[PDB]
Design a protein around this ligand. Structure first.
Ligand SMILES: *[C@@H]1O[C@H](CO)[C@@H](O[C@@H]2O[C@H](CO)[C@@H](O[C@@H]3O[C@H](CO[C@H]4O[C@H](CO)[C@@H](O)[C@H](O)[C@@H]4O)[C@@H](O)[C@H](O[C@H]4O[C@H](CO)[C@@H](O)[C@H](O)[C@@H]4O)[C@@H]3O)[C@H](O)[C@H]2NC(C)=O)[C@H](O)[C@H]1NC(C)=O
Ligand SMILES: *[C@@H]1O[C@H](CO)[C@@H](O[C@@H]2O[C@H](CO)[C@@H](O[C@@H]3O[C@H](CO[C@H]4O[C@H](CO)[C@@H](O)[C@H](O)[C@@H]4O)[C@@H](O)[C@H](O[C@H]4O[C@H](CO)[C@@H](O)[C@H](O)[C@@H]4O)[C@@H]3O)[C@H](O)[C@H]2NC(C)=O)[C@H](O)[C@H]1NC(C)=O
Ligand SMILES: *[C@@H]1O[C@H](CO)[C@@H](O[C@@H]2O[C@H](CO)[C@@H](O[C@@H]3O[C@H](CO[C@H]4O[C@H](CO)[C@@H](O)[C@H](O)[C@@H]4O)[C@@H](O)[C@H](O[C@H]4O[C@H](CO)[C@@H](O)[C@H](O)[C@@H]4O)[C@@H]3O)[C@H](O)[C@H]2NC(C)=O)[C@H](O)[C@H]1NC(C)=O
Ligand SMILES: *[C@@H]1O[C@H](CO)[C@@H](O[C@@H]2O[C@H](CO)[C@@H](O[C@@H]3O[C@H](CO[C@H]4O[C@H](CO)[C@@H](O)[C@H](O)[C@@H]4O)[C@@H](O)[C@H](O[C@H]4O[C@H](CO)[C@@H](O)[C@H](O)[C@@H]4O)[C@@H]3O)[C@H](O)[C@H]2NC(C)=O)[C@H](O)[C@H]1NC(C)=O
Ligand SMILES: *[C@@H]1O[C@H](CO)[C@@H](O[C@@H]2O[C@H](CO)[C@@H](O[C@@H]3O[C@H](CO[C@H]4O[C@H](CO)[C@@H](O)[C@H](O)[C@@H]4O)[C@@H](O)[C@H](O[C@H]4O[C@H](CO)[C@@H](O)[C@H](O)[C@@H]4O)[C@@H]3O)[C@H](O)[C@H]2NC(C)=O)[C@H](O)[C@H]1NC(C)=O
Ligand SMILES: *[C@@H]1O[C@H](CO)[C@@H](O[C@@H]2O[C@H](CO)[C@@H](O[C@@H]3O[C@H](CO[C@H]4O[C@H](CO)[C@@H](O)[C@H](O)[C@@H]4O)[C@@H](O)[C@H](O[C@H]4O[C@H](CO)[C@@H](O)[C@H](O)[C@@H]4O)[C@@H]3O)[C@H](O)[C@H]2NC(C)=O)[C@H](O)[C@H]1NC(C)=O
Ligand SMILES: *[C@@H]1O[C@H](CO)[C@@H](O[C@@H]2O[C@H](CO)[C@@H](O[C@@H]3O[C@H](CO)[C@@H](O)[C@H](O)[C@@H]3O)[C@H](O)[C@H]2NC(C)=O)[C@H](O)[C@H]1NC(C)=O
Ligand SMILES: *[C@@H]1O[C@H](CO)[C@@H](O[C@@H]2O[C@H](CO)[C@@H](O[C@@H]3O[C@H](CO)[C@@H](O)[C@H](O)[C@@H]3O)[C@H](O)[C@H]2NC(C)=O)[C@H](O)[C@H]1NC(C)=O
Ligand SMILES: *[C@@H]1O[C@H](CO)[C@@H](O[C@@H]2O[C@H](CO)[C@@H](O[C@@H]3O[C@H](CO)[C@@H](O)[C@H](O)[C@@H]3O)[C@H](O)[C@H]2NC(C)=O)[C@H](O)[C@H]1NC(C)=O
Ligand SMILES: *[C@@H]1O[C@H](CO)[C@@H](O[C@@H]2O[C@H](CO)[C@@H](O)[C@H](O)[C@H]2NC(C)=O)[C@H](O)[C@H]1NC(C)=O
Ligand SMILES: *[C@@H]1O[C@H](CO)[C@@H](O[C@@H]2O[C@H](CO)[C@@H](O)[C@H](O)[C@H]2NC(C)=O)[C@H](O)[C@H]1NC(C)=O
Ligand SMILES: *[C@@H]1O[C@H](CO)[C@@H](O[C@@H]2O[C@H](CO)[C@@H](O)[C@H](O)[C@H]2NC(C)=O)[C@H](O)[C@H]1NC(C)=O
Ligand code: NAG
Ligand code: NAG
Ligand code: NAG
Ligand code: NAG
Ligand code: NAG
Ligand code: ZN
Lengths: 188, 152, 188, 152, 188, 152
């Protein structure tokens, strides 16, 4: 691009792969579905979804009360990394376990082979504006416009899954995730 | 000046930015390019084992600038997504401005005309800067007393 | 105002109403009595006071243990907003429910039509300097000089009341309140 | 420059501040006026529905400056309460300084004499600036080579 | 030092004693042993040590669950200051009592005259990277290189002791300690 | 300029730093010396009873600069331990640069040669600054119109 007879408009594009290969990243499939990935070579991931379907019940499932680690089965080989990444996500949400609604996770004898963590974001369950806080935090973390949309039941659900390259990693999302988790060790 | 390794960029070319343009990084707090340079320098000096990126991510990346760009993205406003940066280069002399972020709308890079005023005037500044450093360089070497003697 | 024969000193005064109409604000009646207003048109408010009178007792009243929302009666129409504003206040105090003394709130069968939250700031009840921390936080939040004054019983009491234009809103106080609550949704 | 809307102020008059004075906002971190301008600009662009003020309040209002002013207020020291700002205006030319906070003691605005030394030098500086931009403006257009030819 | 015929290299050394006389400070004996001191004249202190032998057991000792102040005996004259300094240390570590492993402190009927607080940092007890997080936080706080060293049992132990001038005061360590504890009252 | 108290230093001598050198503190964010000056000023004005140092420690001490220096210390890289600061002083005139931190390696102060380039060029800048303020001072007093008349 030639601005004038002695001036040219030039550009450079960065490659942020080696900076963020070994750190947690995230990406958006659509405005309701997000994926968090421990590092590039991890064969598993955690998807975060805004749902209108009640998947866990207080009468059948476990309350997360300072025991989030119990929500992952002891036989999972990446159990420690899974619990870590769950904590990374909870810090990224600015979640306050003292005042925010108590999350639910699946019963210990669940037949389904995935870890569910359910936060009730239905209006009136938490304080006024708690659901808007969660949706706007999702927009900050993943670039979601779900907060900018039109009182039924909603839930923020984090479930584990196998990594199938569902979405391409976003290094801006990586910077948001790491900034919300300053001081927590990462990178191998 | 400081230059970027082949793995830093995607153009497969060597890019050295002079210290004159990079000296504006310390004063500016709205330059995403300077934040990217700080990240890349930290990563390079770490590569050449414990990763300390989470301890210094606040020092390298401005949370306020990232938040502002994210909020612009959420409002369907042009925003910086920290990938492509444009700069004005005086080809004959090699002097150049500090690179500025190439904005994005609708998951598409902003067209050159859509921010023409950003790089027209910027280009002007470069020329003016190239005509203002010469005066300062001469003034740095020659004292005011010598000029006074020439008057009389 | 005139400085010299070719220059003048002049000023501008800002109007901060429209910026802070829809956000929580606060006001100082005196150095011991404070009011937090959820927004300009709200008919209720939260009074925060430094008292020397024991109003709630551990033997008769409930202690706040991850159930602050229970301290507001379910029949209150603005219950969700009141619980939210209480959380805004606790978050503006930099309160740590893990290490700070457990707050008390009124019993379920209380005859008084007030939601009362009591924090014991008597010397020796918490760690050394906890009461000074609370009083200096009150000074930061509301402009209080109570910390800069001359070991009896003291409490920080947050009760609910009807808005009666007890003060005039302060946008510096609003700025402090919002800065302590960054990311929490507000504004309607 | 930037023109304040009628609802922003209480004087019921149009007040426009030139870009020359407002260019000092980016470098300065102790200017409460620039924080107020950022807040007003964010609110204006939001008005013209989700309120995002809590997401950007850190980026618009400096917590350290607010803390410093509050601590000065608690110690019965002159402090800024973010309401009234004074500036020096060159009436004949229209050039003006960047507005500075009008301090408060005992719930009373500081009298003009009590910060007289503050607005004397500022006024002087304004004049000096008006005598320093002219040299830079000429130096921006005319290169040093042309001046050298005139010497010989 | 003479740079040239008309210039010289000159230096100034600061004395930060009076700035930090009345505030908590910390010291490093070696890369595993650190001491936190309330102020210059305090006759007690708290040492923080990375140990390889367990001192407290879940079967015999007390879990720290919102009751850290119970870990100091009521008869201690500096009990309130000791509990405060423990909270200062826990804030300096960026400890999250909701997601981090529950600390242990000694039983009530303990024969030893020490207040022990034990955090299990053995790999697998917490989430992945928790031990590295703690060791790197120790390096940030005291200047320790223990994180930069070569899966046996490991603990972070805070015990109380008498100040015997174990170290020299370090004002960089004091600055880190106070930055992690912004807003908490100190200085007498 | 601002002059340090006897108890602030360990040399048992009076050290006054001019306002010209200290004016760079506001723009700079990597100067540990300016952070030390802010702490000392806050302590002095507090001494001349509630201590408010924990409320303003963020405003006086940059956590990012401290974290960067600590991380350099942990990696066995030269770092600032906030104790000794060096500056270039023009003995004949008394003008001096803003003091910069004397780095430390292996619990030992860095030798003068190991950062010679830091204080060679710095010294040069001082002289250049002493030859650049004279031009600005004259330009501040005399307008451009007077120079134009002399040309014709
Ligand atoms: C994290 O930790 C929390 C606690 O800190 C766990 O929540 C507890 O989970 C246990 C085990 O499932 C629950 O115990 C069961 O509760 C029921 C009776 O509990 C009464 O009291 C609680 C008060 O805590 C009330 O909420 C509840 O309504 C009841 O009034 C029964 O369903 C169960 O009875 C079973 O055991 C008894 C004897 O042991 C048998 O006779 C019964 O037939 C039956 O088998 C059982 O006692 C406990 O209630 C939960 N507490 C709370 C507060 O919710 C979380 O599960 C844990 N999370 C993870 C992920 O580990
Ligand atoms: C997402 O998260 C979920 C939930 O946390 C994970 O699902 C768990 O996966 C583990 C393995 O990683 C499962 O554990 C395995 O289950 C099998 C046996 O289960 C039966 O166990 C007894 C047998 O009668 C009964 O209760 C019942 O029939 C159960 O179905 C076996 O495959 C494994 O046992 C074998 O290996 C272990 C360890 O090597 C040995 O001790 C055993 O002897 C045996 O050789 C193992 O126990 C676990 O059940 C799953 N949890 C749930 C809740 O279903 C997902 O793996 C995870 N996904 C990703 C991608 O991360
Ligand atoms: C937030 O949540 C907390 C708990 O998480 C609530 O606090 C509990 O409140 C309940 C209901 O008032 C209390 O239960 C009552 O406690 C007494 C006996 O409790 C023993 O154990 C507790 C340990 O938890 C000790 O503190 C206490 O000293 C006792 O040793 C009795 O007063 C009550 O007995 C009543 O019920 C029984 C049968 O149910 C009857 O026989 C009796 O006659 C009587 O009616 C009752 O059990 C409980 O103790 C509280 N726990 C704690 C830890 O304080 C908060 O109230 C809640 N806050 C809000 C705002 O909702
Ligand atoms: C500050 O906070 C306090 C405490 O949280 C609030 O006070 C509560 O106010 C609510 C209403 O907002 C009160 O609830 C109402 O009480 C009345 C009935 O109370 C009696 O209930 C039975 C009847 O025998 C007995 O236990 C006893 O006699 C009680 O006195 C009625 O006015 C209401 O009932 C009517 O409305 C509801 C809902 O519409 C219907 O379900 C009923 O059938 C009926 O039509 C209602 O229940 C509550 O009691 C108060 N709490 C306390 C602790 O006293 C303040 O309102 C709040 N103030 C502000 C300004 O925010
Ligand atoms: C901070 O607060 C926590 C609780 O909030 C305290 O932890 C409790 O400590 C008490 C003792 O101080 C423990 O009580 C003892 O526990 C055993 C039985 O508990 C059952 O249930 C708990 C669930 O809470 C399980 O962990 C446990 O395995 C058991 O299934 C027994 O050892 C004791 O019995 C004693 O009393 C009974 C009657 O009172 C007698 O018959 C017995 O002979 C014996 O004397 C006793 O009940 C309690 O379990 C602890 N809770 C938890 C969750 O760990 C911390 O100690 C406290 N910390 C500080 C520093 O104060
Ligand atoms: C580090 O932290 C530890 C643990 O918190 C502290 O050790 C405690 O120190 C206190 C004193 O500060 C000890 O309390 C004293 O113990 C003695 C009596 O203990 C016996 O008590 C009965 C008597 O039969 C039995 O249980 C048993 O035999 C005990 O050994 C006495 O010296 C004291 O009592 C006297 O003073 C009190 C108050 O003045 C009076 O009420 C008494 O009547 C009597 O006159 C006192 O009770 C406590 O036991 C220690 N804790 C532990 C766990 O051992 C360290 O002091 C602390 N160190 C530093 C440097 O801070
Ligand atoms: C998540 O939170 C929501 C919001 O509180 C919960 O849904 C609500 O559940 C309550 C009962 O717990 C429902 O109240 C009932 O409604 C009807 C009359 O409207 C009737 O069955 C009863 O008299 C009672 O009042 C309430 O309607 C319902 N709200 C909505 C919007 O559906 C939900 O249970 C929570 N889910 C989990 C998994 O935690
Ligand atoms: C708020 O905290 C204060 C401070 O701890 C509590 O007051 C204190 O209560 C204790 C008992 O719980 C009092 O101790 C008693 O004192 C006398 C002798 O001095 C005697 O009755 C007993 O032997 C016992 O030692 C203590 O004096 C008292 N302190 C003060 C300053 O009054 C208060 O109970 C707490 N209130 C609430 C509502 O939580
Ligand atoms: C601190 O955390 C560590 C790490 O989890 C705990 O040590 C671990 O304790 C478990 C039992 O609770 C040990 O598992 C046992 O190991 C052998 C076979 O390897 C056998 O005895 C049993 O079948 C069982 O699997 C585990 O080996 C052990 N890990 C290490 C590295 O020693 C420790 O108990 C915790 N300590 C405290 C005081 O909390
Ligand atoms: C920044 O935005 C640009 C487009 O404005 C992104 O570049 C696109 O990347 C996708 C893959 O995600 C490619 O398929 C497209 O061909 C690219 N488009 C262009 C025009 O180059 C870029 O990835 C964005 N970066 C971030 C971090 O979001
Ligand atoms: C800043 O301080 C000034 C006074 O120094 C305040 O202006 C006064 O406001 C009150 C209402 O609270 C009026 O009754 C007075 O007439 C005003 N005085 C003057 C001299 O104008 C102003 O409100 C303060 N602003 C804040 C945010 O505290
Ligand atoms: C900064 O580092 C210097 C050394 O590089 C420290 O000065 C030493 O202090 C010890 C006491 O700890 C004395 O015994 C030495 O004689 C000093 N050495 C020199 C060369 O002066 C200084 O204490 C350090 N400051 C901090 C805050 O760590
Ligand atoms: C953005 O541009 C795309 C591509 O042309 C178009 O499909 C879309 O409608 C535009 N607007 C929005 C709000 O996405
Ligand atoms: C972008 O602008 C150029 C001229 O600079 C024009 O040729 C081109 O068509 C424009 N692209 C689009 C997609 O409008
Ligand atoms: C402040 O000024 C007011 C108004 O004159 C006066 O009443 C008061 O005593 C002064 N001092 C203090 C400390 O408030
Ligand atoms: C640092 O220098 C000291 C003093 O000479 C020496 O003992 C030590 O080996 C050096 N290296 C390290 C890594 O400490
Ligand atoms: C430091 O450098 C000086 C010259 O500037 C030299 O004389 C001296 O020996 C050096 N010191 C060490 C310890 O190497
Ligand atoms: Zn800055």
């Amino acid at each position: 691009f030639r601005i004038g007879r002695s001036t040219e408009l030039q550009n450079i594009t960065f490659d942020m792969l080696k900076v963020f290969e070994d750190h947690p990243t995230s990406c958006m499939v659509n405005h309701s579905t997000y994926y968090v990935h421990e590092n590039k070579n991890a064969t598993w991931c955690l998807e975060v979804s805004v749902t209108d379907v009640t998947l866990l019940m207080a009468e059948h499932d476990r309350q997360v009360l300072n025991n989030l680690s119990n929500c992952v089965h002891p036989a999972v080989e990446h159990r420690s990394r899974m619990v870590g990444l769950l904590e990374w996500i909870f810090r990224a949400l600015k979640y306050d376990f003292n005042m925010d609604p108590t999350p639910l996770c699946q019963k210990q004898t669940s037949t389904v082979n995935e870890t569910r963590v359910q936060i009730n974001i239905t209006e009136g369950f938490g304080s006024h504006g708690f659901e808007d806080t969660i949706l706007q935090r999702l927009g900050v973390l993943f670039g979601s416009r779900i907060a900018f949309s039109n009182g039924k039941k909603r839930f923020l659900l984090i479930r584990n899954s196998t990594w199938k390259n569902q979405c391409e990693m976003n290094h801006v999302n990586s910077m948001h995730l790491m900034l919300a988790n300053a001081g927590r060790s990462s990178g191998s | 000046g400081y230059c970027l390794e082949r793995w830093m960029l995607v153009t497969s070319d060597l890019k050295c930015f002079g210290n004159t343009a990079l000296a504006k990084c310390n004063l500016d707090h709205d330059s995403e390019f300077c934040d990217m340079l700080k990240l890349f320098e930290f990563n390079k000096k770490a590569i050449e084992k414990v990763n300390l990126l989470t301890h210094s991510i606040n020092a390298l990346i401005s949370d306020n600038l990232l938040m502002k760009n994210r909020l612009k993205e959420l409002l369907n406003t042009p925003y910086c997504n920290y990938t492509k940066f444009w700069y004005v280069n005086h080809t004959a002399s090699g002097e150049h401005s500090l690179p500025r972020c190439w904005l994005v709308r609708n998951n598409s890079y902003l067209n050159e005309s859509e921010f023409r005023n950003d790089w027209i005037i910027e280009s002007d500044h470069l020329l003016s800067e190239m005509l203002n450093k010469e005066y300062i360089d001469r003034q740095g070497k020659t004292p005011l007393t010598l000029v006074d003697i020439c008057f009389w």
